[PDB]
Amino acid sequence: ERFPADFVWGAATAAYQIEGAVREDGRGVSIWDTFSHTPGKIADGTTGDVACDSYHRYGEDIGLLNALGMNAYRFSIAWPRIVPLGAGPINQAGLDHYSRMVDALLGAGLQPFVTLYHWDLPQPLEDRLGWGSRATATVFAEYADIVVRQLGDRVTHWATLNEPWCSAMLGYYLGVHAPGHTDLKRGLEASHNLLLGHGLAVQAMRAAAPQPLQIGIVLNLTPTYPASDSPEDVAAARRFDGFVNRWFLDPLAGRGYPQDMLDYYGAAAPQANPEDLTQIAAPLDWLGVNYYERMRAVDAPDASLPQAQRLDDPDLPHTADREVYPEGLYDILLRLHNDYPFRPLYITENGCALHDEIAEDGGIHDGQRQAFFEAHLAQLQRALAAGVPLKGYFAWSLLDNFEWAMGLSMRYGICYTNFETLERRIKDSGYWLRDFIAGQ
Numbered sequence: 425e426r427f428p429a430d431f432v433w434g435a436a437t438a439a440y441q442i443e444g445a446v447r448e449d450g451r452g453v454s455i456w457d458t459f460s461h462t463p464g465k466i467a468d469g470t471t472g473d474v475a476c477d478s479y480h481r482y483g484e485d486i487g488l489l490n491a492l493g494m495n496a497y498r499f500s501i502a503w504p505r506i507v508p509l510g511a512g513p514i515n516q517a518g519l520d521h522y523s524r525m526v527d528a529l530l531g532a533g534l535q536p537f538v539t540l541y542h543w544d545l546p547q548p549l550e551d552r553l554g555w556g557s558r559a560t561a562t563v564f565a566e567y568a569d570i571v572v573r574q575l576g577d578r579v580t581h582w583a584t585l586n587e588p589w590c591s592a593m594l595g596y597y598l599g600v601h602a603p604g605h606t607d608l609k610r611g612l613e614a615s616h617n618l619l620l621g622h623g624l625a626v627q628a629m630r631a632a633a634p635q636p637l638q639i640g641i642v643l644n645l646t647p648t649y650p651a652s653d654s655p656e657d658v659a660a661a662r663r664f665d666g667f668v669n670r671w672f673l674d675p676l677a678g679r680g681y682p683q684d685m686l687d688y689y690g691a692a693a694p695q696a697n698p699e700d701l702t703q704i705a706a707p708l709d710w711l712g713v714n715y716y717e718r719m720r721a722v723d724a725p726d727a728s729l730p731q732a733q734r735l736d737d738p739d740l741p742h743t744a745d746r747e748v749y750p751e752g753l754y755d756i757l758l759r760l761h762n763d764y765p766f767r768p769l770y771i772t773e774n775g776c777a778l779h780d781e782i783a784e785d786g787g788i789h790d791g792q793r794q795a796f797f798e799a800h801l802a803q804l805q806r807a808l809a810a811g812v813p814l815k816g817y818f819a820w821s822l823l824d825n826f827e828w829a830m831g832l833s834m835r836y837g838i839c840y841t842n843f844e845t846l847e848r849r850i851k852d853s854g855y856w857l858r859d860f861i862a863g864q
């Protein structure tokens with residue numbers, strides 16, 4: 425029934441998805457500015473140029489967090505505002521903005537949980553191969569140092585990267601996210617340099633920190649289940665599990681890259697000398713789990729890598745874009761608790777998209793999103809009962825925002841955003857979360 429008294433209850437955003445003000449106060453160009461302004465890349469012709477205008481309206485966002493009774497806010501810092509050239513001088517005006525934001529959050533009793541990298545790589549670094557270059561890992565660590573020196577007197581909880589699998593595989597292999605390349609070797613090289621940048625940044629942040637910090641990384645994880653017990657289907661499930669989950673979990677845990685995936689990738693695998701792997705395994709103080717769906721895998725030898733296709737379950741509920749399987753959150757947390765060394769754990773992203781509209785009465789009656797939260801929170805109680813060291817939960821997202829290649833057309837907020845007027849309104853699910861948290 426009851427969560428621990430000191431549990432962290434928050435909502436989460438990312439800078440490019442909400443901030444707007446893309447040319448203000450010295451901000452440089454990110455890969456997502458370039459990508460969203462490329463014809464045909466965004467489903468609805470929108471960009472993040474304005475988004476929720478949270479660069480100017482973060483006070484309203486704080487008012488929403490307060491109205492919801494949250495005690496934490498997970499947000500990201502835009503590297504293009506801090507080091508507009510990617511590698512080069514700092515932009516003090518960008519640091520001052522986030523310093524004021526942090527003070528406003530603390531004044532409201534909200535603990536900041538800061539993500540350093542949520543996909544907005546400075547374009548000048550992509551012009552020099554982006555995450556395909558080891559140099560980008562080095563300058564990411566320099567950026568991390570700069571930010572912790574100025575904000576680490578007030579922010580204790582930091583994550584280096586959000587979802588490196590997406591940055592590497594969607595951005596460099598499948599081409600659906602910025603920068604939009606379509607080359608497997610590039611994607612795997614990017615995955616290595618992202619992990620190396622994480623490891624270098626952890627060490628840089630600890631040396632620059634004015635006080636002890638709690639440093640983590642945030643991974644999207646997908647529990648995978650074979651469609652049958654045949655050797656082919658079980659092997660497909662293992663391959664998909666390696667492709668998404670173990671490729672990142674194992675090196676972070678000091679276990680190297682998984683050998684079965686190295687064999688499967690062959691010559692496309694990155695060159696990883698042991699010195700890099702030692703750096704990648706820098707000790708972490710927590711791990712963030714982003715959880716949305718499961719994968720029920722069937723062998724697909726004709727399909728592209730990793731030759732495993734999803735077996736849709738038409739009996740399960742579906743949102744605007746995903747299948748709902750709350751029990752997979754329990755499964756993945758138990759697996760992490762039993763099989764990997766990371767603890768404590770936070771749920772850093774959990775939420776769903778729906779075709780939300782404002783009803784005649786003025787509210788947003790998003791019953792499926794309420795049911796989504798209720799079902800996933802029940803699985804967290806089961807995980808806690810099993811001894812999983814869970815310390816907090818962040819709903820994705822505080823407000824409807826720019827959903828990457830889907831644009832403004834895919835609403836994940838617990839608050840509704842009118843993109844024409846920038847008004848925010850709490851959805852029914854947000855009031856349910858408020859009242860549930862108040863009961864705790």
Ligand SMILES: *[C@H]1O[C@H](CO)[C@@H](O)[C@H](O)[C@H]1F
Nearest residue numbers: 438586587714773820827
């Ligand atoms: C986690 O997934 C959500 C929904 O696709 C994205 O909006 C976040 O940026 C990502 F971190």
